Amino acid sequence: AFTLADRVTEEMLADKAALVVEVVEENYHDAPIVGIAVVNEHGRFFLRPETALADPQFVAWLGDETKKKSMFDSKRAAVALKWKGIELCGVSFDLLLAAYLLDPAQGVDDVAAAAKMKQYEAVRPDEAVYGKGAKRAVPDEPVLAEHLVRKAAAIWALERPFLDELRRNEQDRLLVELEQPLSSILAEMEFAGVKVDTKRLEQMGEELAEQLRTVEQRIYELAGQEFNINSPKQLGVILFEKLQLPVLKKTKTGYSTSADVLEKLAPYHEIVENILHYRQLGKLQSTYIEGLLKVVRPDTKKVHTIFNQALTQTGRLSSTEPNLQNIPIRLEEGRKIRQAFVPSESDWLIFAADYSQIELRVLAHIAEDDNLMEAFRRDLDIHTKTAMDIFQVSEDEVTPNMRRQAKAVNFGIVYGISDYGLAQNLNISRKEAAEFIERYFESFPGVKRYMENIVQEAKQKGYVTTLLHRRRYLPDITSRNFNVRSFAERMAMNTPIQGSAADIIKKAMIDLNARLKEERLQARLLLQVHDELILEAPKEEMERLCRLVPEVMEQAVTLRVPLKVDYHYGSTWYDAK
DNA sequence: GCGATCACGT
DNA sequence: TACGTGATCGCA
């Protein structure tokens, strides 16, 4: 039983409570709060949001840091409250983040899934209450109130077993001193948003739309007919049946038309390069021009991404609506999209700082490979140095292609692709790709020892850990299916690297946020993109940020090799180059 | 709505 | 044959 409360009472304002501030819209920015549940020592309460959020006592309680609250996904509630001008403070336990740390593979995305991990089932899955997709809807107050109170009661009951297991895992500080403080920082970043120059995007979209119209009609003349170029099935009929082009790779449905195969088909027919060009432009047009414009808020002309802090199995952040971690950078045609991301105030600039090879540096530290550590202590170009060692040549004799291949090997450790994926990366036979790995391991015997030892440790312990004690369980490491086992082995290798790099960037973000307030700067964190932090700040703060930001990021952790940070500022994201 | 394909980032 | 998000198409 619970109290369907008409008025906020003092007993609802205890200094420890499980709190539910329910935002049902997936995108919680400027989104309705549909109800509020409080469970504490005095009872279980349901409050109507129009009532509670108009009560000065309740609002003050929400903002009192000394009034401790346990929640699930507090960032959703905090951001939704920010859009109403209300601060949420004192969240001392976030069940979503706790469950994520305990086992990222469970996919915990509602209270019921977290509660199941502790054999607590007195709460329904959110999707059973709200429905899915089209039929999604807020239910009537009795149904809604019961659900919110049950979620709050679950959070109340589950704090102690989650904290206990975190303590046993040595993840208590990881939760309380890293992920939870980071959650508040992400909330501010999402709420601030990034200003977009929508007229420049529209101008880009106009230039693409005319270039698409031209490549499109060229393709139809080359195909002798019109067809849906965006339809991989139809393009497959044109290329492989009508034009008799050789089939170099298959997919489950039919023949591949990936940029992979197309480049190898270009010498056979004029249409292929035009198809490729059409795919480039259409990717920019559909995903990046039209995609961004769809999610710019016309009130603020900002995009307000949502960082998902409890999703990746490595501890990396992901971001959605829009995903700003895949804005093109590699090709100039697509890099120019970043010119659309501008400072949100006049006479401010974008400041971007990025770790140089943090993943390989983490590997050098974790593997204690003398050669790799020395390379970073010498601040060498790691790809050039790797080519020198693999091919047994001096720096003067590294060709561009030798560096490209060494870079692909290093790439294949940072991500832990298969030797098959290396072979395919370098368009080289699987066997020659294998003697590349072997030459690498004789030049870097500490990395080899690390790969072997971490695989054994994953098998023996059942999981691998990162520098800050994030863990990833790898049950497939004992599998008899070769492909399933190999992937688990690669994850055993890659996760302490990628996850430790993620850990360092998170600590840097926390340290930078504290330092920015210490220094009384107006600079504000806007975006993290895996290895980069992007800020905006008055132009009068650039010079201080050039010293402060790299210092904070480089001192976030002490490794056996230096951390190196490159930084740039400019009038747009593009120009912060 | 779902699976399959493709492609973008780190 | 890292970690993802998202657009499109084709099918029921």
Sign of CA dihedral A544, A545, A546, A550: positive
Please state whether strand B lies within 7 Å of residue A359 at its CB atom: no
* Nearest-angstrom CA–CA distance, A563 and A255: 45
Question: What domains sit in chain A, N to C, each tagged with a CATH number?
Answer: 3-194 (3.30.420.10), 198-318 (1.20.1060.10), 359-501 (1.10.150.20)
Contact present, A208 and A281 (Cβ < 8 Å): yes
- Please state, in angstroms and rounded to a whole number, the distance separating the CA atoms of residues A239 and A232: 10
The C1' atom of B4 and the CA atom of A553 lie apart, in whole Å, by 41
Residue ranges for the known binding site of A for dATP are 329, 415
CA distance A176 to A178: 6
Q: What is the amino acid identity at position A501?
A: A
Cβ-contact A360, A410 below 8 angstroms:
yes
CB of A228 nearer than 7 A to strand C: yes
A20 - beta bridge partners? A37
DSSP-assigned states of every residue in A535-547? EEEEGGGHHHHHH
In the block, which residue shows the tokens 């740390």?
A101
- What is the DSSP secondary structure assignment for residue A318, as one 8-state letter? E
Please, what's the b/e burial string for A198-226 (b: 16 or more CB within 10 A of its CB; e: otherwise)? eebbeebbebbeebbeebeeebbebbeee
CA A564 distance to own-chain centroid? 21
What are the structure tokens assigned to A192, written together? 């601030």
Q: Would you call A431 exposed, middle or buried from its count of C-beta atoms within 10 A (0-12, 13-18, 19+)? A: exposed
| CB < 7 A to strand B: residues 185-224, chain A | none
Q: What is the resolution of this structure in A?
A: 2.2
Strands of A145-267, DSSP E: 194-196
Amino acid A519 CA to nucleotide B7 C1' distance, rounded Å = 42
Residue whose entry in the numeric block shows the structure tokens 């929640």 = A71
Q: How far, in Å, is the CA of A334 from the C1' of nucleotide B8?
A: 10
Provide the positions of strand B that have an atom within 7 A of a protein CB.
1-2, 4-10
> Can you give the distance from the CA of residue A432 to the C1' of nucleotide C2 in angstroms?
21
Report how far residue A97's alpha carbon sits from residue A114's, in angstroms, rounded to the nearest whole number: 10
Q: Which residues contact A471 (CB under 8 A, 6 or more apart)?
A: A101, A103, A169, A171, A463, A464, A465
Closest to A352 (Cα-Cα) out of A377, A329, A378: A329
Q: What region does A315 belong to: left with phi over 0, alpha with psi -120 to 50, or beta?
A: left
Q: Which nucleotide lies nearest residue A411, CA to C1'?
A: C2
Other Cβ atoms closer than 10 A to A428? 15
> Protein A25 CA to nucleic acid B1 C1', in Å?
19
Integer angstrom CA distances of residue A303 from A186, A197, A434: 14, 11, 45
CB neighbour list of residue A331: distance below 8 Å, 6 or more residues apart: A280
| Dist CA A515 CA A529 (whole Å) | 20
Contacts of A511 (CB under 8 A, 6+ apart): A552, A555, A556
Distance of CA A24 to the CA centre of its chain: 22
Which nucleotide is at minimal CA–C1' distance from A262? B6
Q: How is residue A297 annotated by DSSP? A: B
Question: What's chain A's length in residues?
Answer: 577
Q: How far apart are CA A324 and CA A328, in angstroms?
A: 9
3-state DSSP assignment of residue A21:
strand
Identify whether the C-beta of residue A512 lies closer than 8 Å to the C-beta of residue A549.
yes
Please, which residues have CB within 8 angstroms of residue A63's CB and are 6 or more apart in sequence?
A: A86, A87, A88, A89
Determine the distance from the C-alpha atom of residue A303 to the mean position of all C-alpha atoms in its chain, rounded to a whole number. 16
Q: Is A168 left (phi over 0), alpha (psi -120 to 50) or beta?
A: alpha
* Cα distance between residue A36 and residue A86, in whole Å: 14
User: Residues of A comprising the binding site for dGTP?
Assistant: 357, 403, 407, 411
What is the torsion angle, in degrees rounded to the nearest 10, for the CA atoms of residue A13, residue A14, residue A16 and residue A19? -30
The conformational region for residue A321 under phi > 0 = left, psi -120 to 50 = alpha, else beta, is left
Q: Is A248 (CB) below 7 Å from strand B?
A: no
